[PDB]
Amino acid sequence: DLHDKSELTDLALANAYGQYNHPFIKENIKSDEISGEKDLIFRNQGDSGNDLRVKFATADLAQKFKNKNVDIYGASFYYKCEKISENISECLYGGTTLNSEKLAQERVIGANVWVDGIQKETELIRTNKKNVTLQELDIKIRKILSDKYKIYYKDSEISKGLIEFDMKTPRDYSFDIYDLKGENDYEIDKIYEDNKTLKSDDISHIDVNLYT
Amino acid sequence: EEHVIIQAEFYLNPDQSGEFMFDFDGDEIFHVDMAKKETVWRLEEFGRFASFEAQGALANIAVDKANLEIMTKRSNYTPITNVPPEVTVLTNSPVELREPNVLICFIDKFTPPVVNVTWLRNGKPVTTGVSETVFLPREDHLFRKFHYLPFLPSTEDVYDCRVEHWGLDEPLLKHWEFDA
Amino acid sequence: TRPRFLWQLKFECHFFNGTERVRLLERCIYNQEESVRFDSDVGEYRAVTELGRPDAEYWNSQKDLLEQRRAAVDTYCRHNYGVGESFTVQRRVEPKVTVYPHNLLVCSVSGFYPGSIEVRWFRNGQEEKAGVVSTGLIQNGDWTFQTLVMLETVPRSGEVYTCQVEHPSVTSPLTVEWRA
């Protein structure tokens, strides 16, 4: 029993469109400033000169990447973002990996897609990171689904969806595309603060199931 | 190695007959009935939790049909060389008089995938309980096929599996009778 | 009768050690002559006859097509493996073992699945591989196999001949004896 698109509010549906069609992507940056033990502060390195606040789940994580060159990929937002100073603070959860851990050669992940049982065209996503966040992967799959199936448009025929990330090992991660946990990114994106990261070569594929 | 799953499909002209099926270590998992436009599982049980959209099959077939046209020309209309079948009639298990059994007609190593099979009890065509598989793929790109006739072993009976194929001059009649 | 023209397409997923090693082979066959193919181990199409040469280079030039065929090992092979695993890989059907008669003892082992099986003969608890003859592994076409394993003997009054069958459907070996 998947959540229905009709359970979301126009705002949630809007913030869903925004973050998956316009993720925040910065390559290689350092931060020597924790904030509240759970965040890493990258001053003036956010959109339009804004200071960026990358929020994590536990202090251990923010610690792990402090003082290191990292890559950033993930949903960004402002509303409800704790301010750090005079300048505006842009927030993002997890989506952090070490800039130096890049794959030998680019990795291509295939994604099967069905709509009410009908097999559709296969989709492709790539990454050259040796370790990529589930967020980066989720966002890239949702972008395609957004353009191809109009998943976050209020009046589209799709009302239910499930994305499955299969690992070569019998492991499997999944998301109900309409099971957002609120209408604000500040709430919605807390799902990524664990900064879950996968080994790109260990990944097998993605299965997408949508329903009208 | 361990296992092999094969998605096999073909289109034949001028018959305009096509096929689409899945194989697992030599056994059919399912095929799509081109006419009915429904997928048929080899054992009903398979259809309980696994499913396949027959629509997906038809799409593929339309392309196969189109490629056959292209290869027919590119090859200068060189036709296929008939390869008559090897027909063998086995029994499901050791026959014992009056003990239920199944006559198996194994049609093998042939091409093209077009065949006309008939079971004959004491010289009469039979239909009572007869079943069959679709054409199965061979690594030599030839085909396999199975037909079945459940029966009750008797001394008063004789069976025959008649197979007709273009690479055969006369039909190939393989006989079976209780050997006492 | 009319000349036939045949087109075949086969996607073979070879699995080694569960799903650890996977090899995808996409084969194109005109009539009975394979013309081009995609071998996941090669990473791109290769023509097997001059006829496929046009198709291999036209297809290899479409990046997204090859990215797709390369990833098929996972999205296709591995995926379909997990789909039917419960009723193909895990399928287990116990064989029905029977034993019956210078003599020729017959050990009938039928209706079992998978095809992997061991059938040993024993004369008074001592194995005998000599003089042993068999039909080989017969595939019935219905997701079951059969086989007859015979032993040529000189049955002396008192000897005990046993047929032992080792098959995955049963933890401990199956044995049926015959008293001479």
Binding site: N112 | A50, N67, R74 | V83, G84
Partner: peptide, 13 residues
């Protein structure tokens, strides 16, 4: 669980 098919390609002309 659904079986996925591999799409057949159009031959060159």
């Amino acid at each position: 669980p659904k079986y996925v098919k591999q799409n057949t390609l159009k031959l060159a002309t």
